Design a protein around this ligand. Structure first.
Ligand SMILES: OC[C@H]1O[C@@H](O)[C@H](O)[C@@H](O)[C@@H]1O
Length: 311
């Protein structure tokens, strides 16, 4: 008997602390989650934090696919750590690449990973949300994603019908596969998340993990017809949601540092406003790393960028 929409506003605006737990090992990618971070975030005025987690490398590959305890223990440190500063939290299964290239083979392990996770946290504050799986793609096609997400729901609810669940989209989590999304009729406490990076060439200009991203380096943002496109996409989102009775959460959105601060502030500000206009919850892609809004070793936010994220 929970209202997801009421839960979506609880979540509100927040941010990702990535390049952390979704890396092969925490640190591998530069960021190690400090307990103090939750202070900055809170005092900073954020309602929640999203913590991407790569469980797939911290769990046995043979039945019953048990999750290794030191890691599990580490996630606990991070959960209550955010809960302290009164921040709400979103955890998920992030970068499970073998599942994206061979779903059927890893489907079993996946369902098992959630059974464990849901149980481990089934009685935690209701301000903790469960994100099924980050940006399904590859061979984990849209129609196949629908089947897998439903079974994760059955795995979760059987353990708990208290926490709101976040369901993404396929084809890398953007709007391309939105239409094709199907959340079971019986699920009544879920939120739909979309990653919005749309001006991809702009947001990912120079992303070393994206092939051919070199041809984007140097792009700028802040033009007319420019926003009309994005606006029609936000409307598409909005129309889907109104016709599907599901709240929206923009789980990720941000511009890579190689873009010029100016067009990064214009895009963020714009998209944030368009997101609040439609009353969407959302989280800026990552706190301090290569997409950062807070420079770790130098203690200082990019206040303008931050000003754009905060109301
Ligand atoms: O690859 C660019 C971005 O794609 C998103 O779908 C992932 O969630 C981010 O972690 C990643 O940085």
């Amino acid at each position: 008997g929970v209202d997801p929409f009421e839960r979506n506003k609880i979540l509100g605006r927040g941010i990702n602390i990535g390049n952390a737990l979704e890396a092969p090992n925490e640190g591998d990618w530069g960021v190690v989650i400090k307990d103090e971070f939750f202070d900055i975030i809170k005092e900073a005025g954020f309602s929640h934090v999203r913590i991407p987690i790569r469980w797939s490398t911290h769990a046995y590959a043979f039945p019953p696919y048990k999750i290794m305890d030191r890691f599990f223990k580490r996630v606990d440190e991070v959960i209550n750590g955010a809960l302290k500063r009164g921040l709400a939290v979103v955890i998920n299964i992030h970068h499970y690449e073998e599942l994206m290239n061979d779903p059927e083979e890893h489907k079993e392990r996946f369902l098992a990973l959630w059974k464990q996770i849901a149980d481990r946290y089934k009685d935690y504050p209701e301000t903790l949300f469960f994100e099924i799986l980050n940006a399904p793609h590859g061979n984990l096609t849209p129609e196949k994603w629908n089947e897998l997400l439903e079974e994760a729901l059955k795995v979760i609810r059987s353990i708990d019908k208290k926490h709101t669940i976040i369901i993404g989209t396929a084809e890398w989590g953007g709007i391309s596969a939105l239409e094709k999304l199907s959340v079971p009729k019986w699920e009544k406490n879920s939120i739909v998340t979309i990653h919005y990076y749309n001006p991809f060439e702009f947001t990912h200009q120079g992303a070393e993990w994206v092939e051919g991203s070199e041809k984007w380096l140097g792009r700028k943002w802040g033009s007319p017809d420019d926003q009309k496109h994005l606006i029609e996409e936000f409307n598409f989102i909005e129309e889907w949601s109104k016709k599907n009775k599901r709240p929206i959460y923009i789980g990720e959105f941000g511009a890579y540092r190689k873009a010029d601060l100016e067009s990064r502030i214009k895009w963020t500000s714009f998209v944030v406003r368009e997101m609040e206009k439609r009353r969407w919850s959302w989280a800026y892609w990552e706190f301090c790393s290569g997409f950062g809004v807070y420079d770790t070793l130098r203690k200082t936010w990019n206040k303008d960028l931050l000003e754009a994220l905060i109301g």
